[PDB]
């Protein structure tokens, strides 16, 4: 099989879709005109990440990871209030002579405490471009960093209990793909796109990669994100 999805960008794939909280992305249904842009819906494929024997995790803040993407990232420059859901496809390519487990999870409104208590940090200590950040096995101890200990998730919670959020497991000896459709979750209808991070995506490897001898020393992980049902404030006069 292969579903061969298209939008102006074709991705061939396929497990099954895990819809957020059982709610699909949807348009918001005056003195606030609004208007959607339906030309932003299309896949945007972030750079591949090497999963090796060393690596212990990764994270990306949204929607600051699609800020440099064409059109979607240009509506953030113009319109000052926006909303949008997402469809995220995380997929690996590996043999049958490799082994591993991953946890793909979307955590809404994940605050992260700094490394060195009572110290402020910059906004380039957790978000910058579409670059993937990295967790560290040992405790962080640097003035201008987020606490990146992997067993606390950078929030002071159990790492095993992050299965309370929308998630799916990529076990390499069974499947090799996961899909999460996240809806818009916030306490207001629309919010500024640069002052707030709606959620974070995380890939956490329980069970380290192993692959014997004379085989590829890494497995690539490829994240693909297409915004669904984006809507922005109107820019034209009322009658």
């Amino acid at each position: 099989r292969s579903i061969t999805l298209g939008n102006s960008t074709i991705t061939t794939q396929e497990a099954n879709v895990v819809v957020g909280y059982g709610r699909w992305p949807t348009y918001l249904r005056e003195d606030q005109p609004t208007q959607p842009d339906v030309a932003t819906c299309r896949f945007y494929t972030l750079d591949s990440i090497k999963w090796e024997k060393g690596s212990v995790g990764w994270w990306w803040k949204f929607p600051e990871a699609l800020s440099d993407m064409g059109l979607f990232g240009q509506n953030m420059q113009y319109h000052y209030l926006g909303r949008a859901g997402y469809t995220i496809h995380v997929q690996c390519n590996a043999s049958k002579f490799h082994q591993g487990c991953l946890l793909v999870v979307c955590v809404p409104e994940a605050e992260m405490g700094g490394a060195v208590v009572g110290q402020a940090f910059s906004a380039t200590a957790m978000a910058n471009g579409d670059k993937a950040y990295e967790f560290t096995s040992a405790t962080q101890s640097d003035q201008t960093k987020v606490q990146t200990a992997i067993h606390n998730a950078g929030m002071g919670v159990g790492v095993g209990n992050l299965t309370i959020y929308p998630h799916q497991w990529i076990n390499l000896r069974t499947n090799n793909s996961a899909t999460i459709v996240m809806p818009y979750i916030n306490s207001v209808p629309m919010d500024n796109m640069f002052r707030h991070y709606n959620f974070t995506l995380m890939v956490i490897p329980f069970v380290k990669l192993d692959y014997a001898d004379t085989a590829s020393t890494y497995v690539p992980i490829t994240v693909t994100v297409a915004p669904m049902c984006a809507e922005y404030n109107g820019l034209r006069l009322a009658q």
């Binding site: 034209r236 006069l237 009322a238």
Partner: peptide, 20 residues
């Protein structure tokens, strides 16, 4: 967004501003 107001043919022009 703009309106060309001609004062030869009109004497008043009205705007209605949203998002206040």
């Amino acid at each position: 967004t703009h309106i060309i107001w001609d004062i030869g043919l009109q004497s008043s022009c009205v705007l209605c501003v949203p998002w206040i």
